[PDB]
Write a protein that binds this ligand. Structure first.
Ligand code: ADP
Ligand code: CL
Ligand code: CL
Ligand code: CL
Ligand code: MG
Ligand code: NA
Length: 297
């Protein structure tokens, strides 16, 4: 319901990468002033892929098996480390390979033969570019329309869904679709379909979003404005300040995530930042965007 409890918060974290939970940064407008940003978590340069994942992502997976939705988004300027955090490499796997291994192992266990629940994992992969929704699994299929059902579920009819059981099944569809990317939102959707095999025969579904956003060079508060980054900011603020109006419908991203941001959903936004001087303006801007609180000290 709209009333009877405020909406769930959007958790916010900062990941400061090495040179290649409050943060303090110099104010180059006034050198007597220091900018102090507050987050739900802070991961410094010594924080590894497993630290990010065990600290902020692993704990929300169990909520997908309760029929709850979850969103993980990497925000920040190009070069900051969004793709490193979200995808990573075979040496240092990111959030996506870690959550996929865990979720598939969890569903292979909880949905095994003889278990009271039948579990089926599917995947979808899309891109948000210039407010157009594009299926990365079925390219050259056009701008997709986002709909809503009578129960409040967000759905994209005809967006391709691939059934997956093992990691190889995930790799089969994901790796080729992964291969501009700095200027578009990469949305991986992992859907857990749950069927009770004994009375009362309940049916659940948990949707997990893993998002590698467009570079925040395109999101300096009032460079071009990315409608979906701008509206995400408004939506995150509305949810984390308890404002009566949340403008989900003002962008494709927030409309797609309407049932996976706020409500009873679990969500984590990671503000990826870099330590180099050449990033300073985009660092300040990413911190203003994502911080749950800000002070001038
Ligand atoms: N936490 C990190 N530790 C080490 N290297 C990192 C880290 N994050 C990013 N990098 C490196 O920084 C560069 C840019 O990172 P990338 O993930 O492509 O950023 P983005 O996707 O935000 O533009 C790459 O060479 C990548 O390996
Ligand atoms: Cl360490
Ligand atoms: Cl690492
Ligand atoms: Cl939910
Ligand atoms: Mg990237
Ligand atoms: Na409510």
């Amino acid at each position: 319901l709209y009333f009877q409890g405020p909406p769930a918060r959007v958790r916010v974290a900062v990941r400061l990468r090495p040179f290649v939970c409050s943060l303090e940064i110099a104010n180059w407008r006034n050198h007597q002033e220091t900018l102090k940003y507050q987050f739900d978590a802070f991961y410094g340069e010594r924080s590894t892929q497993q630290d990010i994942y065990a600290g902020s992502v692993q704990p929300i997976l169990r909520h997908l098996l309760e029929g709850q939705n979850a969103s993980v988004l990497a925000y920040g300027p190009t070069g900051a480390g969004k793709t490193h955090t979200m995808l990573g490499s075979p040496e240092q796997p990111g959030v996506i390979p870690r959550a996929l291994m865990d979720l598939l192992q969890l569903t292979r266990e909880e949905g095994a033969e003889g278990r009271p629940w039948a579990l089926s994992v599917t995947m979808s992969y899309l891109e948000i570019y210039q407010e157009k929704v594009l299926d990365l699994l079925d390219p050259a299929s056009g701008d997709l329309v986002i709909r809503e059902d009578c129960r409040g579920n967000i759905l994209i009819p005809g967006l391709s869904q691939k059934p997956i059981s093992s990691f190889a099944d995930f790799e089969r569809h994901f790796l080729p679709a992964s291969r501009r990317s700095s200027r578009s939102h990469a949305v991986l959707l992992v859907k857990v379909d749950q069927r009770e095999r004994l009375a009362p025969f309940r049916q659940r579904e948990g949707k997990l979003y893993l998002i590698d956003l467009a570079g925040s060079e395109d999101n300096r508060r009032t460079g071009a404005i990315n409608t979906s980054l701008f509206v995400l900011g408004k939506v995150v603020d509305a949810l984390n300040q308890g404002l009566p109006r949340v403008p989900y419908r003002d962008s494709k991203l927030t409309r797609l995530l309407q049932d996976s941001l706020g409500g009873s959903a679990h969500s984590i936004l990671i503000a990826n930042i870099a330590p180099e001087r050449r990033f300073y303006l985009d660092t300040v801007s990413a911190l203003n965007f994502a911080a749950r609180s800000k002070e001038v000290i």
